[PDB]
């Protein structure tokens, strides 16, 4: 659910993920940020401009401060570009973004 | 003493030997009926383990099948709920991209033909 | 001599008694083996009825769970084939749409 | 994935050697949709043949909305398009059968959701 228009922090983020294996993304919230039903984590190609450019996404898990979603291998890009996790608010605002990674 | 007294003795020994034999048979039957019942009991020991092991192994096997089918079902179906939302998003956005690309291609060819 | 005859019949009857004991020990052991073998066979038959009875007590739930799981897994494989194709095709469309926007821009400002 | 960026030529198209005998004119507004199709023995089916939902007017087989692989056990077969495979707008759509060569072997009469 994108548009054409650091409260969340990603941790444990690897630089290379195994191609065709499930990927588990880990994150916590910060500065009394509280989540909502329709916040999502997307996988984005580095250099994207609009939240419409997610490769794939998943709605967040609502509630140990740690949080995680499980991206099944078939949600995952199969090329060699740089990618990055991004937590998007209910109102399209980016509230976090991870370090770049590849599937290789 | 006499020849006659020997015959008399010998006849008693025949009956004595027949009686002793009769009682050996009785003791042999009592002893075999005891060992028969130890055999019946040793066998029930074995059979109690064999039957109950085989039955309990079948219980456990089917319990494990049920459990794993239910864990599989549950996880597969919480996955479908996530896949459903993705596919609605993807199929819809892709159809718009297709339309936007057609409009841009129409704009390009109008600009090349000027 | 009658004494002679009874002296001999004594020894032959003692020997005969000995062999009837031995012959009776052997038949009794064969009877026990026979009984043992019969018991094993009849119990093992009955065990079989019981196990078959028990096989069915949960057959209806295994067959239900199994057929739901077959069908939601077949729907999962379709959804994974679809998601992989849609995801990949969008990513291409995004690149193609960006390069078309650059082509339009350059042509407008030519 | 299936589909190609080639323009389909009219005479590389066979619209009727797969028949969509279920096709309603206004497909039942909600819920799943069963796609019933009949082969006419004009070609040998293959396992990576697929059925797509196409907007009436499509130029290439890359333009499917969604698709499903064909199912193999020969005359009547079925696929169930879950509701989330279906368009939500008012355009006219079509089932098309496409084979492993990207050749169109059947295309249904149009309909709406």
Swiss-Prot record, chain A:
Induction (UniProt): Treatment with IFNB1/IFN-beta and IFNG/IFN-gamma show an increase in number and size of CALCOCO2-specific dots and partial redistribution to the cytoplasm. IFNG/IFN-gamma increases gene expression only slightly and IFNB does not increase expression.
Post-translational events: (Microbial infection) Cleaved by S.pyogenes SpeB protease; leading to its degradation. Degradation by SpeB prevents autophagy, promoting to S.pyogenes intracellular replication.
Tissue spec. comment: Expressed in all tissues tested with highest expression in skeletal muscle and lowest in brain.
Source superkingdom: Eukaryota
Subcellular location: Cytoplasm, Perinuclear region; Cytoplasm, Cytoskeleton; Cytoplasmic vesicle, Autophagosome membrane
Protein purpose: Xenophagy-specific receptor required for autophagy-mediated intracellular bacteria degradation. Acts as an effector protein of galectin-sensed membrane damage that restricts the proliferation of infecting pathogens such as Salmonella typhimurium upon entry into the cytosol by targeting LGALS8-associated bacteria for autophagy. Initially orchestrates bacteria targeting to autophagosomes and subsequently ensures pathogen degradation by regulating pathogen-containing autophagosome maturation.
Subunit structure, interactors included: Dimer. Part of a complex consisting of CALCOCO2, TAX1BP1 and MYO6. Interacts with MYO6. Interacts with GEMIN4. Interacts with ATG8 family members MAP1LC3A, MAP1LC3B, GABARAP, GABARAPL1 and GABARAPL2. Interacts with ATG8 family member MAP1LC3C. Interacts with LGALS8. Interacts with TOM1; the interaction is indirect and is mediated by MYO6, which acts as a bridge between TOM1 and CALCOCO2. Interacts with AZI2.
Protein family per UniProt: Belongs to the CALCOCO family.
Domain notes: The MYO6-binding domain is required for autophagy-mediated degradation of infecting bacteria such as Salmonella typhimurium, but not for bacteria targeting to autophagosomes.
Name by which UniProt lists this protein: Calcium-binding and coiled-coil domain-containing protein 2
Species assigned in the record: Homo sapiens (Human)
Name of the gene encoding the protein in the UniProt record: CALCOCO2
UniProtKB/Swiss-Prot annotation, chain C:
Domain writeup: The FFAT motif is involved in the interaction with MOSPD2, VAPA and VAPB and its phosphorylation regulates these interactions.
Tissue: Expression levels correlated closely with those of RB1 in cancer cell lines as well as in various normal human tissues. Abundantly expressed in human musculoskeletal and cultured osteosarcoma cells.
Miscellaneous remark of the record: Probably involved in the tumorigenesis of breast cancer. RB1CC1 is frequently mutated in breast cancer and shows characteristics of a classical tumor suppressor gene.
UniProt name for this protein: RB1-inducible coiled-coil protein 1
Known role: Involved in autophagy. Regulates early events but also late events of autophagosome formation through direct interaction with Atg16L1. Required for the formation of the autophagosome-like double-membrane structure that surrounds the Salmonella-containing vacuole (SCV) during S.typhimurium infection and subsequent xenophagy. Involved in repair of DNA damage caused by ionizing radiation, which subsequently improves cell survival by decreasing apoptosis. Inhibits PTK2/FAK1 and PTK2B/PYK2 kinase activity, affecting their downstream signaling pathways.
Modification Phosphoserine, positions: 85
Subunit structure: Part of a complex consisting of ATG13/KIAA0652, ULK1 and RB1CC1. This complex associates with ATG101. Interacts with PTK2/FAK1 and PTK2B/PYK2. Interacts with GABARAP and GABARAPL1. Interacts with ATG16L1; the interaction is required for ULK1 complex-dependent autophagy. Interacts with RNF111, SKI and SMAD7. Interacts with COP1 in the cytoplasm of proliferating cells in response to UV stimulation. Interacts with TP53. Interacts with C9orf72. Interacts with WDR45B. Interacts with ATG13; this interaction is increased in the absence of TMEM39A. Interacts with WIPI2. Interacts with TAX1BP1.
Similarity section: Belongs to the ATG17 family.
Annotated compartments: Nucleus; Cytoplasm; Cytoplasm, Cytosol; Preautophagosomal structure
